[PDB]
Design a protein around this nucleic acid. Structure first.
Lengths: 71, 489
DNA sequence: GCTAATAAACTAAAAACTATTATTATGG
DNA sequence: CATAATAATAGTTTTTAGTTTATTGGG
């Protein structure tokens, strides 16, 4: 997960559209390239349902996901 | 708004009320008693905020407050009771008629002005607010005024007096039902219900007052005074009343906290709320818990307008309610709200809002479907225009279902059951069913309150029939049933 | 191969309407 | 610092959100 946010763009105090990416460490770019070339073929069924993002996880108890057992 | 409704029963008792009346069945007295008993039962099961009374004109042994002649009062204005039912049923049937003759007789002179006098006195007797007053009078006389015209004039004057006071009287054919042969004289200034009263439909309560006069705050500046009106409530039996076995005495229930450690008593202040999570015993305060339940002030903060497409049948919550403007502390709300309501054809886009019905409770987002003015040609406004209080379920309100998938079936079975369900058509009526449990409970109450031998088991429309729909559909239900290996084991 | 998420009461329910009694702003 | 006063406070009842009974449930 990138340290920054991923992905009404401004309803109440939203995130920026984009950030510079050519000014970051080349090692970080290499790592991002490696992880993306490993991940484009495999992301996970949860991500197919909904991806745990940097901001969505922070905002709410998304990974908590309160729910009862099978009816 | 409270107020008691009154209905007074007047019946002839001189000579024509205990006769065959060109029939072979019982006298008019017997089923008149049956009808008033039925209305007693209906009122008891319907509402206890009403008073009823019984008076007989034509009297050999007078008993009334003013002590006139040929005026006898049996039961005054009062809430109906089981002892009233016993008193009434003591004079039912032929045995009741002869008991009445033994203790009351028959054959006196009617005095209509005196009847109006005593009924007005009875109305003056009650100290409660009279929301509505009504008089019913049933007799075999279409015009009992062959006597002196002075009595007729006095009766007309008294009728005018009570009409000015607000009293209304009812009379309808008993001797010759049908034909408009009744009220030869009473048709002047006085204006079949036998089956309706005898139907004694019960197990229906009545609304007394609305609730929750809240504010429609479209912003932080402007508000609209409205009142949320209920239209459906899940009825249930009245709560049981704890009683003493020996004396049938009400019990002063007294629940309290206690400690076996010292034998003393704990106040509601020093008893702290507690929770268990992980490796800690979380302790909380009652007032802290109440504040936790508190989110904001009650009100309707408008959130926007959402097109009437997001609402889905499979997305449903606690019942929706009705909203009507209520100009009591904010004026101009009614006119603006009405302007909004009439503009609904363009306003198919439903209003969006978050609802806080009362204080210190979390709000739920609720859409506002504009209700229409479904006026009827009979000048009946069913569901006047307003807004539906449809509750929007939260993300946690959905339980996950298995993802098993099924593909489209063959259309021939689809067509055969299409014909099946088309032939087996049921004309749905909204007011066509009653809860069997509640009505059965009412039957038990009305049964195990009198000296009734065995209870009546009212037949409900809820119970499915065994073959009536089968013959309404025919044998094609099995003839068309060509499914191979039915799942029956 | 002995621990059910059920829903009947759990428990005591933040409610107004229509009815009277304590304060005053004032005669003195 | 008085008295033909006066009213803005209270008080009874409707109806929702709290919790116990009971039945499908294994290492």
């Amino acid at each position: 997960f990138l340290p920054f946010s991923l992905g009404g763009p401004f309803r109440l105090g939203g995130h920026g559209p984009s950030f510079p990416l050519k000014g970051i460490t080349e090692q970080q770019k290499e790592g991002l390239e490696i992880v993306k070339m490993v991940m484009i073929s495999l992301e996970g069924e949860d991500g197919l349902d909904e991806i745990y993002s940097f901001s969505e996880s922070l905002r709410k108890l998304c990974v908590f996901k309160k729910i009862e057992r099978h009816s | 708004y409270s107020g008691r409704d009154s209905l007074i029963f007047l019946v002839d008792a001189s000579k024509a009320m205990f006769e065959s009346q060109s029939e072979d069945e019982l006298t008019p007295f017997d089923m008149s008693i049956q009808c008033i008993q039925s209305v007693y039962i209906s009122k008891i099961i319907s509402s206890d905020r009403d008073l009823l009374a019984v008076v007989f004109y034509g009297t050999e042994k007078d008993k009334n407050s003013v002590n006139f002649k040929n005026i006898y009062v049996l039961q005054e204005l009062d809430n109906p009771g089981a002892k009233r039912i016993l008193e009434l049923d003591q004079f039912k049937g032929q045995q009741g008629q002869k008991r009445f003759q033994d203790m009351m007789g028959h054959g006196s002179d009617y005095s209509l002005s005196e009847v109006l006098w005593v009924c007005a006195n009875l109305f003056s007797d009650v100290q409660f607010k009279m929301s509505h007053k009504r008089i019913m009078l049933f007799t075999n006389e279409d015009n009992p005024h062959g006597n002196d015209s002075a009595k007729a004039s006095r009766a007309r004057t008294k009728a005018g007096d009570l009409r000015d006071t607000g009293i209304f009287l009812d009379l309808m054919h008993l001797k010759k039902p049908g034909g408009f042969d009744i009220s030869l004289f009473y048709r002047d200034i006085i204006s079949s219900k036998l089956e309706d009263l005898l139907r004694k439909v019960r197990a229906k309560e009545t609304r007394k007052r609305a609730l929750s006069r809240l504010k429609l705050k479209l912003n932080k500046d402007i508000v609209i005074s409205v009142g949320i009106y209920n239209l459906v409530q899940k009825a249930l039996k009245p709560p049981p009343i704890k009683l003493y076995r020996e004396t049938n005495e009400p019990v002063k229930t007294k629940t309290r906290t206690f400690n076996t450690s010292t034998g003393g008593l704990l106040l509601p202040s020093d008893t702290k709320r507690s929770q268990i999570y992980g490796s800690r015993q979380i302790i909380l305060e009652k007032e802290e818990t109440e504040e936790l339940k508190r989110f904001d002030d009650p009100g309707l903060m408008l959130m926007g307008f959402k097109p009437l497409v997001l609402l889905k049948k499979h997305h449903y919550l606690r019942p929706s309610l009705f909203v009507y403007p209520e100009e009591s502390l904010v004026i101009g709300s009614s006119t603006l709200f009405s302007a909004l309501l009439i503009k609904c054809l363009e306003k198919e886009v439903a209003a969006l809002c978050r609802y806080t019905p009362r204080r210190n409770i979390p709000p739920y987002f609720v859409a506002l479907v504009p209700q229409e003015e479904e006026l009827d040609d009979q000048k009946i406004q069913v569901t006047p225009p307003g807004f539906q209080l449809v509750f929007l379920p939260f993300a946690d309100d959905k339980r996950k279902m298995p993802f098993t998938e099924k593909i489209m079936a063959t259309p021939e079975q689809v067509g055969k059951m299409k014909a099946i369900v088309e032939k087996l058509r049921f004309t749905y009526r909204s007011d066509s069913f009653e809860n069997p449990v509640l009505q059965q409970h009412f039957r038990n109450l009305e049964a195990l309150a009198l000296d009734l031998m065995e209870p009546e088991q009212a037949v409900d429309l809820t119970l499915p029939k065994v073959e009536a729909m089968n013959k309404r559909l025919g044998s094609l239900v099995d003839e068309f049933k060509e499914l191979v290996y039915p799942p029956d084991y």
